[PDB]
Design a protein around this nucleic acid. Structure first.
Ligand SMILES: [K+]
Ligand SMILES: [K+]
Ligand SMILES: [K+]
Ligand SMILES: [K+]
Ligand SMILES: [K+]
Ligand SMILES: [K+]
Ligand SMILES: [Mg+2]
Ligand SMILES: [Mg+2]
Ligand SMILES: [Mg+2]
Ligand SMILES: [Mg+2]
Ligand SMILES: [Mg+2]
Ligand SMILES: [Mg+2]
Ligand SMILES: [Mg+2]
Ligand SMILES: [Mg+2]
Ligand SMILES: [Mg+2]
Ligand SMILES: [Mg+2]
Ligand SMILES: [Mg+2]
Ligand SMILES: [Mg+2]
Ligand SMILES: [Mg+2]
Ligand SMILES: [Mg+2]
Ligand SMILES: [Mg+2]
Lengths: 77, 116, 101, 28, 48, 75, 127, 26, 90, 80
RNA sequence: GAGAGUGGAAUUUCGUGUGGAGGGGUGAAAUCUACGGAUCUACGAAGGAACGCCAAAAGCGAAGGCAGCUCUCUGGGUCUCUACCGACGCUGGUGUGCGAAAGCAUGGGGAGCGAACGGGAUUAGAUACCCUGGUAGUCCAUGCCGUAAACGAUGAGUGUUCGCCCUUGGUCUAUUCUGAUCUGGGGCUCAGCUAACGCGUUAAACACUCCGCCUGGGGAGUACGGUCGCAAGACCAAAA
């Protein structure tokens, strides 16, 4: 593991490794399971999956990982 | 502020029944009996810790415990054996220091003389 | 020693059955050279679970308490209350210096 | 200790400084 | 003398307990009034 | 533990049920339920390790609390 | 004008299976579904969260199909609460297709009981 | 005494228990 | 939060005093830790012992998982109006 | 330990809001109200007066002084 | 600690309603179990074992060990005293007793678990690990055995040695919230000690009393002999 000493929290020890449009994907696959694998008459789930995809396109890869520097500078103070 | 029992006459026969030794636990009876034995053997009037007083009290406790203790109760039997060895040490002290009290205790409590 | 005899009756037992059992225990205490200092009724109580007997399941009960000065052997001599059909539970405890209200 | 004993028969020379009272307020 | 005073205080405390118990015995139950007192205790109905 | 649903709001009732699961200690006991037998000799080792991680977490919380309390006071 | 005897949806989470049972208020089974009784899933795995969600969704569809408008959900299992939450949410998502119709669930309840140190559990697997 | 030194005694004891159950059974 | 003292517990804790003892169980029916009340270890031992006695005497529940929440003075029998629901709101 | 310390701590068993002398930070050689109360009680005890009478008269003198400085500050506010 | 009573949860089995297709299990499977109706759901019955939460660097015991609750009987410990007594103490060869678990003997009991063993798999093989059945045993009563990494890998005792933070059970003082002093249990540390790791008022520090034990590795805790044991074996224990 990590070397013991000072204070350290992981940048990935939060909710970060959950890429979106997962429940929308499994709901769309569920609708193909129910409606004998047709894209017809449940296009609402298709639209929600697509809008989730453009929402992922609007979103970007950001994570606040500068907490460790602030903890290290508060230790020195 | 007067309680309810301070209006009726007291009942003396029930108070006499209340303090009967049949209504006492075995530990209370042992306490009374050991106080009596200690009164019987004392050297001074406030004497409660001389060697012959301790010998008489230990003899009474040893005789009670050798009869009431269960065979499977090993933890209490270790304490009974400790009482036996304490009584030997006190008798050994009295045999070299106070020979008259040694003979007093051996005669009155019925103990053997074992100088070896 | 001084004891509290707790008696949890079945809720269907009438006044006469309660009096009969309390008086039988009381005459048992007197015959062993004992004093009854106190008898009281806590009324009907609600139970924490459903006590199940051969009659069925009961969620109520009548609570009685007899305080006695009696022999040390009396908890052993009261084991006939384990086979008593008017009772849900019974318990003998050494008397405590606590106000029960 | 003569001088400290004399000056202890006075007002309050045993008054905590501001930093110590600040830290005691900090700890509670 | 200190031992005698200690014993006197112990005996006084025991006598005080005995006197307290002798006063409270006016409400104890004779066998001849057992069922009457059970009836009155059931009627009185001390709260839960 | 039972929770009533008010005005058809399932999520509020489920949040209340989760809160009552957690705060009654029943969730901690359910999570601690075992599927296999653990000997007493292994329970001792588990208790030792749990105490060690509790000591480390207490030390870490004390350091963060001292830093935050000393910083927020304006000294 | 206030009814008492609602139907009960029993959800039992086990490690290897999930049991969803519909009874009346007195415990008479009307319909039920398990992991292996679902028409789609065929072999391989049954311990997933998806299987439990699918079982609850199947029972919710059947409960709408028989016109039940009021149910009590009772959940049971030695799992995290998120799994039971997801099971209850699946049931409603089957009864109604997309959160549209009113909620049939009028009460929710967790019924999980531990042994008060009862029987010795099996020996640990050495894998 | 380390585990490595305990293993030599372990093997000596196993061989002796084996020999004693083979010889002294007869 | 209800501040219970050690002396109050040592004066009140008894398996007959179910109204007092009901403060020391959670809504799942299990015993509360000592560090949640701040009473002495002796007081917590007395509370645990008396609640175990009252449980075996039937006055308190061992567990309330699967039943209604325990309140002193209320029946623990499962009745029809326990799960009373409203349909006229729908 | 000072001989007047129990009386100073008995003055702490009363009204706590008395003076801003501690954060005044002008000198460390003027006594506050509690120390001079305890010294008054101590010298009264050394005179041979009774103990409870000593606390009573010392508290009454302190209350009189506090009311007198209250009415003096009232005169200041009337001039202000 | 021993005795006598008593409680509920859960597991298994059985019964009765409702219901109908699987359940169980794995990395994946199969044996198994189920339409003679299982798993699931409600109520009930039987039985054994262990006592959830409290709850733990807590407590008690010489050690091994000791957990639901009530009562009986009982061993030890702590505190306080202007009480007694008057060195009666420590250690302890040879001896005596107690002593996890497994095992043995006799009689009971048997839910769950499970050496052996049967089967299903994996594998090159698989006398295993995984799955499924499962005997002895695990439990009780009365005896035997006498061993454990029986470990703090630290014999028992006594005196002395800077402090800080907690905590068990008391007592005193309190000045409304804390101090003091005993008592055990923990964490950290000035010294000092240590091959190093570390120990550190519960020492592995500064000293002392008494006992046990060691003298390169292997051969070997083996051979022989004696004693003990119903056996299994145990204790003392070499040499080439
Ligand atoms: K070895
Ligand atoms: K101890
Ligand atoms: K002891
Ligand atoms: K203690
Ligand atoms: K250290
Ligand atoms: K020492
Ligand atoms: Mg591995
Ligand atoms: Mg060595
Ligand atoms: Mg055994
Ligand atoms: Mg047999
Ligand atoms: Mg095979
Ligand atoms: Mg197997
Ligand atoms: Mg089996
Ligand atoms: Mg050995
Ligand atoms: Mg051990
Ligand atoms: Mg203390
Ligand atoms: Mg200490
Ligand atoms: Mg060394
Ligand atoms: Mg020795
Ligand atoms: Mg050997
Ligand atoms: Mg031989």
């Amino acid at each position: 593991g990590r070397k013991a000493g000072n204070l350290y929290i992981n940048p990935k020890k939060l909710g970060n490794l959950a890429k979106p449009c997962m429940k929308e994907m499994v709901s769309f696959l569920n609708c193909m399971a129910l409606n004998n694998i047709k894209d017809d008459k449940c296009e609402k789930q298709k639209q929600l999956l697509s809008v989730c995809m453009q929402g992922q396109s609007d979103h970007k890869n950001k994570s606040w990982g500068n907490i460790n520097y602030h903890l290290q500078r508060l230790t020195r103070g | 502020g007067t309680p309810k029992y301070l209006l009726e006459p007291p009942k003396d026969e029930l108070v006499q029944t209340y303090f009967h030794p049949d209504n006492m636990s075995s530990a209370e009876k042992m306490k009374i009996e050991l106080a009596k034995v200690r009164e019987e053997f004392k050297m001074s009037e406030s004497d409660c810790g001389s060697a012959r007083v301790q010998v008489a009290q230990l003899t009474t406790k040893i005789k009670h415990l050798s009869s009431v203790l269960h065979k499977k109760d090993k933890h209490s039997k270790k304490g009974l054996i400790a009482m036996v060895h304490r009584r030997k040490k006190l008798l050994k002290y009295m045999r070299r220091t106070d020979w008259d009290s040694y003979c007093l205790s051996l005669s009155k409590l019925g103990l053997r003389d074992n100088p070896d | 020693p001084l004891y509290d005899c707790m008696l949890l009756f079945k809720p269907i037992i009438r006044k006469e059955g309660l009096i009969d059992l309390v008086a039988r225990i009381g005459k048992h205490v007197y015959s062993k050279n004992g004093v009854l200092t106190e008898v009281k009724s806590f009324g009907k109580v609600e139970l924490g679970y459903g006590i199940k007997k051969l009659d069925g399941r009961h969620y109520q009960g009548q609570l009685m308490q007899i305080t006695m000065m009696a022999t040390p052997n009396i908890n052993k001599e009261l084991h006939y209350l384990n086979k008593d059909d008017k009772l849900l539970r019974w318990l003998l405890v050494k008397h405590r210096d606590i106000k029960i209200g | 200790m003569h001088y400290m004993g004399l000056f202890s028969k006075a007002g309050n020379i045993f008054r905590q400084p501001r930093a110590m009272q600040a830290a005691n307020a900090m700890l509670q | 003398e200190f031992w005698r005073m200690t014993g006197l205080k112990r005996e006084e405390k025991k006598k005080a307990r005995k006197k307290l118990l002798h006063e409270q015995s006016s409400l104890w139950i004779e066998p001849k009034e057992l069922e009457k007192k059970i009836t009155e205790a059931l009627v009185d109905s001390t709260t839960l | 533990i039972r929770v009533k649903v008010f005005s058809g709001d399932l999520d509020k009732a489920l949040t209340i049920l989760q809160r009552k699961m957690q705060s009654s200690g029943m969730e901690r006991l359910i999570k601690a339920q075992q599927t296999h037998h653990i000997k007493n000799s292994e329970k001792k080792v588990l208790a030792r390790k749990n105490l060690e991680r509790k000591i480390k977490s207490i030390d870490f919380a004390r350091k963060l609390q001292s830093i935050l309390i000393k910083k927020v006071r304006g000294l | 004008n206030l009814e008492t005897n609602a139907d009960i949806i029993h959800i039992k989470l086990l490690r290897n299976n999930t049991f969803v049972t519909v009874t009346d208020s007195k415990g008479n089974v009307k319909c039920k579904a398990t992991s292996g009784s679902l028409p789609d899933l065929k072999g391989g795995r049954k311990m997933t969260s998806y299987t439990a969600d699918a079982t609850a969704e199947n029972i919710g569809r059947r409960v709408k199909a028989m016109g039940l408008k009021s149910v009590v959900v009772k959940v049971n299992g030695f799992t995290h609460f998120k799994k039971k939450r997801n099971a209850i949410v699946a049931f409603r998502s089957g009864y109604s297709n997309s959160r549209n119709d009113q909620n049939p669930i009028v009460y929710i309840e967790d019924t999980t009981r531990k042994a008060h140190n009862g029987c010795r559990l099996p020996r640990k697997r050495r894998v | 005494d380390s585990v490595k030194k305990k293993r030599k005694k372990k093997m000596n004891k196993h061989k002796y228990r084996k020999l004693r159950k083979k010889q002294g059974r007869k | 939060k209800a501040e219970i003292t050690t002396e109050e517990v040592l004066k009140k804790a008894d398996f007959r005093n179910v109204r007092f003892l009901a403060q020391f169980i959670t809504e799942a029916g299990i015993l509360v830790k000592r560090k949640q009340t701040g009473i002495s270890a002796k007081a917590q031992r007395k509370i645990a012992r008396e609640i175990k006695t009252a449980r075996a005497f039937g006055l308190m529940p061992f567990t309330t998982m699967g039943t209604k929440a325990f309140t002193f003075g209320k029946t623990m029998e499962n009745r029809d109006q326990d799960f009373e629901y409203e349909v006229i709101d729908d | 330990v000072l001989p007047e310390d129990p009386y100073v701590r008995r003055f702490a068993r009363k009204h706590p809001e008395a003076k801003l002398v501690e954060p005044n930070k002008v000198s460390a050689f003027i006594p506050d109200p509690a120390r001079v109360y305890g010294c008054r009680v101590l010298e009264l005890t050394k005179n041979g007066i009774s103990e409870d009478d000593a606390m009573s008269v010392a508290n009454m003198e302190y209350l009189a002084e506090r009311k007198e400085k209250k009415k003096a500050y009232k005169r200041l506010k009337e001039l202000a």
